[PDB]
Enzyme design. Sequence first.
Site, PDB file in Angstrom:
ATOM      1  CG  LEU A 230     120.284  52.598  93.152  1.00 39.99           C
ATOM      2  CD1 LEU A 230     121.304  53.712  93.398  1.00 39.99           C
ATOM      3  CD2 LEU A 230     119.246  52.582  94.246  1.00 39.99           C
TER       4      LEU A 230
ATOM      5  CG  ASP B 177     130.507  32.705 113.498  1.00 39.99           C
ATOM      6  OD1 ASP B 177     129.773  32.262 112.634  1.00 39.99           O
ATOM      7  OD2 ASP B 177     131.553  33.261 113.282  1.00 39.99           O
TER       8      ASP B 177
ATOM      9  CG  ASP C 190     127.617  34.943 111.865  1.00 38.65           C
ATOM     10  OD1 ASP C 190     127.019  33.945 112.300  1.00 38.65           O
ATOM     11  OD2 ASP C 190     128.817  34.969 111.618  1.00 38.65           O
ATOM     12  CG  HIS C 191     126.319  32.467 109.001  1.00 38.45           C
ATOM     13  ND1 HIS C 191     126.581  31.198 109.558  1.00 38.45           N
ATOM     14  CD2 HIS C 191     127.459  33.185 109.100  1.00 38.45           C
ATOM     15  CE1 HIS C 191     127.851  31.183 109.948  1.00 38.45           C
ATOM     16  NE2 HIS C 191     128.410  32.391 109.688  1.00 38.45           N
TER      17      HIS C 191
ATOM     18  CG  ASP D 144     130.969  29.122 112.201  1.00 41.33           C
ATOM     19  OD1 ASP D 144     130.236  29.073 111.208  1.00 41.33           O
ATOM     20  OD2 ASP D 144     132.217  29.202 112.139  1.00 41.33           O
TER      21      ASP D 144
ATOM     22  CG  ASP E 213     119.450  51.838  84.422  1.00 42.83           C
ATOM     23  OD1 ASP E 213     120.046  51.683  85.572  1.00 42.83           O
ATOM     24  OD2 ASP E 213     119.511  51.048  83.479  1.00 42.83           O
TER      25      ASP E 213
ATOM     26  CG  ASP F 200     122.819  51.463  90.207  1.00 41.92           C
ATOM     27  OD1 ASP F 200     121.718  51.067  89.757  1.00 41.92           O
ATOM     28  OD2 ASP F 200     123.136  52.674  90.247  1.00 41.92           O
TER      29      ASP F 200
ATOM     30  CG  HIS G  34     128.179  29.167 107.194  1.00 38.27           C
ATOM     31  ND1 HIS G  34     128.739  30.383 106.865  1.00 38.27           N
ATOM     32  CD2 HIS G  34     128.998  28.600 108.091  1.00 38.27           C
ATOM     33  CE1 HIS G  34     129.853  30.541 107.546  1.00 38.27           C
ATOM     34  NE2 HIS G  34     130.018  29.481 108.299  1.00 38.27           N
TER      35      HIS G  34
ATOM     36  CB  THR H 288     131.868  35.016 109.660  1.00 33.32           C
ATOM     37  OG1 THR H 288     131.473  33.675 109.928  1.00 33.32           O
ATOM     38  CG2 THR H 288     132.020  35.744 110.964  1.00 33.32           C
TER      39      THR H 288
HETATM   40  C1  LIG Z   1     122.290  50.870  99.881  1.00 35.72           C
HETATM   41  O1  LIG Z   1     122.596  52.067 100.660  1.00 35.72           O
HETATM   42  C2  LIG Z   1     123.762  52.722 100.192  1.00 35.72           C
HETATM   43  C3  LIG Z   1     124.195  53.883 101.111  1.00 35.72           C
HETATM   44  O2  LIG Z   1     123.164  54.896 101.092  1.00 35.72           O
HETATM   45  C4  LIG Z   1     123.581  53.220  98.725  1.00 35.72           C
HETATM   46  O3  LIG Z   1     124.910  53.573  98.254  1.00 35.72           O
HETATM   47  C5  LIG Z   1     125.136  54.939  97.944  1.00 35.72           C
HETATM   48  O4  LIG Z   1     124.557  55.335  96.684  1.00 35.72           O
HETATM   49  C6  LIG Z   1     124.866  56.501  95.885  1.00 35.72           C
HETATM   50  C7  LIG Z   1     124.628  56.274  94.316  1.00 35.72           C
HETATM   51  O5  LIG Z   1     125.088  54.945  93.757  1.00 35.72           O
HETATM   52  C8  LIG Z   1     126.349  56.863  96.131  1.00 35.72           C
HETATM   53  O6  LIG Z   1     126.537  58.253  95.854  1.00 35.72           O
HETATM   54  C9  LIG Z   1     127.689  58.381  94.921  1.00 35.72           C
HETATM   55  O7  LIG Z   1     128.958  58.355  95.639  1.00 35.72           O
HETATM   56  C10 LIG Z   1     130.044  59.269  95.381  1.00 35.72           C
HETATM   57  C11 LIG Z   1     130.680  59.618  96.747  1.00 35.72           C
HETATM   58  O8  LIG Z   1     131.342  58.396  97.127  1.00 35.72           O
HETATM   59  C12 LIG Z   1     132.208  58.396  98.306  1.00 35.72           C
HETATM   60  O9  LIG Z   1     131.661  59.025  99.504  1.00 35.72           O
HETATM   61  C13 LIG Z   1     130.715  58.317 100.353  1.00 35.72           C
HETATM   62  C14 LIG Z   1     130.414  59.185 101.618  1.00 35.72           C
HETATM   63  O10 LIG Z   1     131.327  59.036 102.742  1.00 35.72           O
HETATM   64  C15 LIG Z   1     131.221  56.860 100.623  1.00 35.72           C
HETATM   65  O11 LIG Z   1     130.292  56.017 101.332  1.00 35.72           O
HETATM   66  C16 LIG Z   1     131.578  56.124  99.313  1.00 35.72           C
HETATM   67  O12 LIG Z   1     131.866  54.715  99.599  1.00 35.72           O
HETATM   68  C17 LIG Z   1     132.037  53.825  98.423  1.00 35.72           C
HETATM   69  O13 LIG Z   1     133.356  53.815  97.855  1.00 35.72           O
HETATM   70  C18 LIG Z   1     134.341  53.460  98.873  1.00 35.72           C
HETATM   71  C19 LIG Z   1     135.748  53.746  98.365  1.00 35.72           C
HETATM   72  O14 LIG Z   1     135.799  53.335  96.999  1.00 35.72           O
HETATM   73  C20 LIG Z   1     134.122  51.998  99.316  1.00 35.72           C
HETATM   74  O15 LIG Z   1     135.048  51.552 100.319  1.00 35.72           O
HETATM   75  C21 LIG Z   1     132.685  51.819  99.843  1.00 35.72           C
HETATM   76  O16 LIG Z   1     132.428  50.424 100.159  1.00 35.72           O
HETATM   77  C22 LIG Z   1     131.693  52.350  98.783  1.00 35.72           C
HETATM   78  O17 LIG Z   1     131.743  51.412  97.661  1.00 35.72           O
HETATM   79  C23 LIG Z   1     130.400  51.155  97.160  1.00 35.72           C
HETATM   80  O18 LIG Z   1     129.783  52.338  96.530  1.00 35.72           O
HETATM   81  C24 LIG Z   1     130.475  52.816  95.316  1.00 35.72           C
HETATM   82  C25 LIG Z   1     129.888  54.150  94.774  1.00 35.72           C
HETATM   83  O19 LIG Z   1     130.281  55.213  95.692  1.00 35.72           O
HETATM   84  C26 LIG Z   1     130.571  51.676  94.261  1.00 35.72           C
HETATM   85  O20 LIG Z   1     131.307  52.102  93.096  1.00 35.72           O
HETATM   86  C27 LIG Z   1     131.130  50.352  94.901  1.00 35.72           C
HETATM   87  O21 LIG Z   1     130.971  49.273  94.008  1.00 35.72           O
HETATM   88  C28 LIG Z   1     130.417  49.942  96.209  1.00 35.72           C
HETATM   89  O22 LIG Z   1     129.064  49.561  95.914  1.00 35.72           O
HETATM   90  C29 LIG Z   1     132.660  56.927  98.519  1.00 35.72           C
HETATM   91  O23 LIG Z   1     133.961  56.863  99.132  1.00 35.72           O
HETATM   92  C30 LIG Z   1     129.670  60.500  94.520  1.00 35.72           C
HETATM   93  O24 LIG Z   1     130.955  60.999  94.145  1.00 35.72           O
HETATM   94  C31 LIG Z   1     128.718  60.155  93.326  1.00 35.72           C
HETATM   95  O25 LIG Z   1     128.355  61.264  92.406  1.00 35.72           O
HETATM   96  C32 LIG Z   1     128.551  61.164  90.920  1.00 35.72           C
HETATM   97  O26 LIG Z   1     127.448  60.544  90.171  1.00 35.72           O
HETATM   98  C33 LIG Z   1     126.538  61.283  89.261  1.00 35.72           C
HETATM   99  C34 LIG Z   1     126.420  60.543  87.893  1.00 35.72           C
HETATM  100  O27 LIG Z   1     126.959  61.222  86.727  1.00 35.72           O
HETATM  101  C35 LIG Z   1     126.802  62.809  89.095  1.00 35.72           C
HETATM  102  O28 LIG Z   1     125.593  63.569  88.931  1.00 35.72           O
HETATM  103  C36 LIG Z   1     127.569  63.315  90.312  1.00 35.72           C
HETATM  104  O29 LIG Z   1     127.639  64.749  90.372  1.00 35.72           O
HETATM  105  C37 LIG Z   1     128.909  62.554  90.286  1.00 35.72           C
HETATM  106  O30 LIG Z   1     129.463  62.541  88.901  1.00 35.72           O
HETATM  107  C38 LIG Z   1     130.916  62.418  88.638  1.00 35.72           C
HETATM  108  O31 LIG Z   1     131.435  61.137  89.047  1.00 35.72           O
HETATM  109  C39 LIG Z   1     130.941  60.021  88.273  1.00 35.72           C
HETATM  110  C40 LIG Z   1     131.301  58.681  88.936  1.00 35.72           C
HETATM  111  O32 LIG Z   1     132.726  58.528  88.988  1.00 35.72           O
HETATM  112  C41 LIG Z   1     131.467  60.180  86.835  1.00 35.72           C
HETATM  113  O33 LIG Z   1     131.096  59.078  86.004  1.00 35.72           O
HETATM  114  C42 LIG Z   1     130.922  61.480  86.226  1.00 35.72           C
HETATM  115  O34 LIG Z   1     131.217  61.475  84.787  1.00 35.72           O
HETATM  116  C43 LIG Z   1     131.389  62.650  87.157  1.00 35.72           C
HETATM  117  O35 LIG Z   1     132.829  62.837  87.154  1.00 35.72           O
HETATM  118  C44 LIG Z   1     127.445  59.580  93.998  1.00 35.72           C
HETATM  119  O36 LIG Z   1     126.771  60.494  94.878  1.00 35.72           O
HETATM  120  C45 LIG Z   1     126.943  56.528  97.510  1.00 35.72           C
HETATM  121  O37 LIG Z   1     128.361  56.664  97.507  1.00 35.72           O
HETATM  122  C46 LIG Z   1     126.671  55.087  97.950  1.00 35.72           C
HETATM  123  N1  LIG Z   1     127.255  54.821  99.248  1.00 35.72           N
HETATM  124  C47 LIG Z   1     127.699  53.667  99.708  1.00 35.72           C
HETATM  125  C48 LIG Z   1     128.198  53.650 101.164  1.00 35.72           C
HETATM  126  O38 LIG Z   1     127.741  52.635  99.059  1.00 35.72           O
HETATM  127  C49 LIG Z   1     123.038  52.125  97.855  1.00 35.72           C
HETATM  128  O39 LIG Z   1     122.596  52.716  96.593  1.00 35.72           O
HETATM  129  C50 LIG Z   1     121.860  51.367  98.535  1.00 35.72           C
HETATM  130  N2  LIG Z   1     121.444  50.258  97.689  1.00 35.72           N
HETATM  131  C51 LIG Z   1     120.184  50.095  97.260  1.00 35.72           C
HETATM  132  C52 LIG Z   1     119.986  48.925  96.354  1.00 35.72           C
HETATM  133  O40 LIG Z   1     119.261  50.847  97.585  1.00 35.72           O
HETATM  134  N1  YN6 Z   2     138.462  38.787 115.968  1.00 38.38           N
HETATM  135  C1  YN6 Z   2     137.845  38.147 114.937  1.00 38.38           C
HETATM  136  O1  YN6 Z   2     138.374  38.106 113.807  1.00 38.38           O
HETATM  137  C2  YN6 Z   2     136.451  37.543 115.198  1.00 38.38           C
HETATM  138  C3  YN6 Z   2     135.777  36.918 113.953  1.00 38.38           C
HETATM  139  C4  YN6 Z   2     134.721  38.093 113.977  1.00 38.38           C
HETATM  140  N2  YN6 Z   2     135.477  38.682 115.109  1.00 38.38           N
HETATM  141  C5  YN6 Z   2     135.064  39.449 116.270  1.00 38.38           C
HETATM  142  O2  YN6 Z   2     135.791  39.511 117.298  1.00 38.38           O
HETATM  143  C6  YN6 Z   2     133.670  40.218 116.142  1.00 38.38           C
HETATM  144  O3  YN6 Z   2     133.602  40.598 114.769  1.00 38.38           O
HETATM  145  C7  YN6 Z   2     132.754  41.595 114.344  1.00 38.38           C
HETATM  146  C8  YN6 Z   2     131.868  42.346 115.030  1.00 38.38           C
HETATM  147  C9  YN6 Z   2     131.223  43.450 114.392  1.00 38.38           C
HETATM  148  C10 YN6 Z   2     131.467  43.808 113.054  1.00 38.38           C
HETATM  149  C11 YN6 Z   2     132.353  43.005 112.248  1.00 38.38           C
HETATM  150  N3  YN6 Z   2     132.601  43.021 110.902  1.00 38.38           N
HETATM  151  S1  YN6 Z   2     133.544  41.626 110.457  1.00 38.38           S
HETATM  152  N4  YN6 Z   2     133.700  40.976 112.048  1.00 38.38           N
HETATM  153  C12 YN6 Z   2     133.020  41.812 112.922  1.00 38.38           C
HETATM  154 CA    CA Z   3     129.928  33.193 110.941  1.00 34.46          CA
HETATM  155 CA    CA Z   4     120.744  51.398  87.705  1.00 33.89          CA
HETATM  156 ZN    ZN Z   5     131.523  29.140 109.683  1.00 31.91          ZN
END
Ligand SMILES: *[C@@H]1O[C@H](CO)[C@@H](O[C@@H]2O[C@H](CO)[C@@H](O[C@@H]3O[C@H](CO[C@H]4O[C@H](CO)[C@@H](O)[C@H](O[C@H]5O[C@H](CO)[C@@H](O)[C@H](O)[C@@H]5O[C@H]5O[C@H](CO)[C@@H](O)[C@H](O)[C@@H]5O)[C@@H]4O)[C@@H](O)[C@H](O[C@H]4O[C@H](CO)[C@@H](O)[C@H](O)[C@@H]4O[C@H]4O[C@H](CO)[C@@H](O)[C@H](O)[C@@H]4O)[C@@H]3O)[C@H](O)[C@H]2NC(C)=O)[C@H](O)[C@H]1NC(C)=O
Ligand code: YN6
Ligand code: CA
Ligand code: CA
Ligand code: ZN
Length: 805
Positions: A690, A122, A309-310, A262, A692, A688, A421, A160
Amino acid sequence: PWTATSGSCKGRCFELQEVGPPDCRCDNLCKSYSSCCHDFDELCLKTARGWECTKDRCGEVRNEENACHCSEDCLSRGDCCTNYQVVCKGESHWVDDDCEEIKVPECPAGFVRPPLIIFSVDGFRASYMKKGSKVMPNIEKLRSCGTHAPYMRPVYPTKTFPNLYTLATGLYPESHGIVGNSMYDPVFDASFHLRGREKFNHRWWGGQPLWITATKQGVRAGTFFWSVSIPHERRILTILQWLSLPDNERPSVYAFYSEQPDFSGHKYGPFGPEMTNPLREIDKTVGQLMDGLKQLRLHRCVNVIFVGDHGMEDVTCDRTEFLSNYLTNVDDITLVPGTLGRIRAKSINNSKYDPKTIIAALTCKKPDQHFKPYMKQHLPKRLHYANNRRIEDIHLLVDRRWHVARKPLDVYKKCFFQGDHGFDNKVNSMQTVFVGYGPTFKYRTKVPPFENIELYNVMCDLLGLKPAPNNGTHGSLNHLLRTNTFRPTMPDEVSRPNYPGIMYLQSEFDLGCTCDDKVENKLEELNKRLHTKGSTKERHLLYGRPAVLYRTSYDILYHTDFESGYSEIFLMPLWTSYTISKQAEVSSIPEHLTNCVRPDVRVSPGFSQNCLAYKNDKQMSYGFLFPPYLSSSPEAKYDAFLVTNMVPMYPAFKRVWAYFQRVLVKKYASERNGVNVISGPIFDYNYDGLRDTEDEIKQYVEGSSIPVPTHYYSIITSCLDFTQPADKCDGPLSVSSFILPHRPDNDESCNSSEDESKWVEELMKMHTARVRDIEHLTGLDFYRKTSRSYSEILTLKTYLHTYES
Ligand SMILES: *[C@@H]1O[C@H](CO)[C@@H](O[C@@H]2O[C@H](CO)[C@@H](O[C@@H]3O[C@H](CO[C@H]4O[C@H](CO)[C@@H](O)[C@H](O[C@H]5O[C@H](CO)[C@@H](O)[C@H](O)[C@@H]5O[C@H]5O[C@H](CO)[C@@H](O)[C@H](O)[C@@H]5O)[C@@H]4O)[C@@H](O)[C@H](O[C@H]4O[C@H](CO)[C@@H](O)[C@H](O)[C@@H]4O[C@H]4O[C@H](CO)[C@@H](O)[C@H](O)[C@@H]4O)[C@@H]3O)[C@H](O)[C@H]2NC(C)=O)[C@H](O)[C@H]1NC(C)=O
Ligand SMILES: NC(=O)[C@@H]1CCN1C(=O)COc1cccc2nsnc12
Ligand SMILES: [Ca+2]
Ligand SMILES: [Ca+2]
Ligand SMILES: [Zn+2]
Ligand SMILES: [K+]
Ligand code: NA
């Protein structure tokens, strides 16, 4: 939850499968949950006689009360003090041995793959590797014998939890959901914080961290988290005991975490005299692990990653900006404060709250203001910090060495601290470290700086895992590896271009455009036809046509001085490619051509922009992608006024764009010995990162179907060996890129009332980008036809030009 702590840890110390409440726990996290069995300290956290064998303990009778052992049976039990072989069997410390190339894994029988150990530190600032080098011999030996970068770039914010979870998932914080060390999720109506219990809930934690990726594909993982009261010596001994488990039970991946440096850096600053001791102590812990691995005959088997990490910057209480010195209404907001700011309304019942007035009250209000407000969609796209409901609409980018706070009482009802940081991830003080050592890493190899989002893919490659979908570019770090490289193929082009010839007469167009271009020679009549069929295309398109990776309708247009891919759907180029030699001359737009726009007889009226829309739209004007200033001849200049080269531009943005095209392109060609430029629009109305689709566009030129870009990009490529001109380069390339926000004002630039020569280049530097960032925003794939290896091109596409000295 309630826990029946009257169970026992007998034979379960640091067990790998965690049992569910109400059963009592014996794992490395039980302390953090108040859930350990009554006898966990007694059995699992032994301390008697400390951590080192002494000559008098050699051959001792085993005493099971000792923290570690120096008895003859300790190596078969896997529980010797790490220095046992040195003290008792005449062996050398690992750090005292010569570096010897590890060409193949040298593993004990029953090891199916070299294990991976991630050693995370850290607050380990990149410059510690040089400035602390005299007191970190174990770390300096890993660094000099293995593979190292001069620094590794963290993600923003440089805190972190966002960075450790990005290391574990390969995702940006916007995607993994850990967007700060403090958060409010309005859908959950729940708050995440450092102290407390909410942060254990699985709902905060998105994506798929390495330990889950491993477990799903049949690779066993050590637990990556350690309770703060477990001493480092005990963490190391626990890892080394796990490495002595039977084959069927033994993990393949392990993590160690140090809270230092850290913890001290916050109290003393990055280079406080007090910081030498913490660096010595981390180095001693590395020495313990390496000596322990050498005892187990694993020191030429295991891949070790030493990663931070940073970094850490100098920050003091006196360098705090107070929102109370800007806002009248300071009680109507909530601020997440410190090295970044996030603002939301105190109450969602307050229909009086207006973001526009808060942004305006915080914009260029004081001559040396040490923060800049942004709506999150206006942040530099390289930060990838917007597409999450946990990231507040209003963001403050705080200058390095400063804090932001709501009011002065916040800073003294909580000076003390000298380090902090969380700043912009391009800031030199925030950079951190990477070393890879082992059979799978290269020997004595320096690699260029890279981003921490890339490491998940490599850790998956080291363990034979298929990575979950992530933000790394898989293959971009193949140059770190001796073996296990991942051999990606270029994405398939989805849309093939049309190559239109002359199909339309001038009178078919009713675009409301005029040009003074009626000026009639049979020598240069064959030549103009040659230019329109692509005779100069080898000069202006140096790395092949970009590939279009989505379904669309587009035309390639050739010209003497530039080539374009023109979208019939967006009515403008997706891309425009041109080369400017070191010798090129800059010229003016002739007075008679100031408002000249010319129909393109290769493109139908119905797939063309029109000048009437720009006349009627009182906010919007137009610019050109290929700049008329860099025309090769008076006659070629007419090509630059084609309606197929025009793009919508706010007048305020045209000041930025005109300076880039008139002054900066020629400056870059002079400095870099020519440049190839690819420029185009970006549409990211849902922020996003990505491309549009057309149904996501929120703004058109008034009365028309001409969509308004959110951003304009340029990719500027030349020869890394600047003794060769850009258009005759035999070896590696050099690139810089940007993604400029297309804004109707220059409120971002506090000095914008001055000449462009005082503010425009500073704006462009802030909006520096990777080619990969533009690829995501455009659905294009660049550099398809070079003489370079694809992995090298992937590395070039991830390069960021940072403009830190
Ligand atoms: C960086 O890399 C990442 C990972 O590859 C890229 O992110 C992916 O991009 C895809 C497009 O944006 C996206 O795919 C969509 O997801 C839906 C499925 O989502 C769930 O399942 C996966 C798989 O296990 C999971 O990872 C997801 O996780 C997200 O949400 C959880 C719970 O909420 C969070 O804890 C998690 O952190 C994550 O949040 C992040 O992503 C979401 C979007 O999923 C954001 O909203 C958050 O802010 C945050 O960034 C999910 O649990 C799938 O259902 C989608 O499909 C719809 O979209 C089109 C558009 O109309 C349509 O054609 C489809 O058929 C469908 O339509 C219907 O739903 C629409 C939306 O509600 C609705 O409007 C319509 O009218 C329809 O009803 C879609 O496939 C993928 O999930 C994410 N994955 C992750 C991990 O983030 C990212 O793009 C990369 N970045 C760059 C800059 O390159
Ligand atoms: N016990 C703690 O809270 C201390 C502070 C960070 N942590 C660890 O023991 C090592 O922590 C990680 C390792 C890998 C992924 C992680 N996502 S957020 N923290 C992570
Ligand atoms: Ca840290
Ligand atoms: Ca976009
Ligand atoms: Zn710190
Ligand atoms: K206009
Ligand atoms: Na301004």
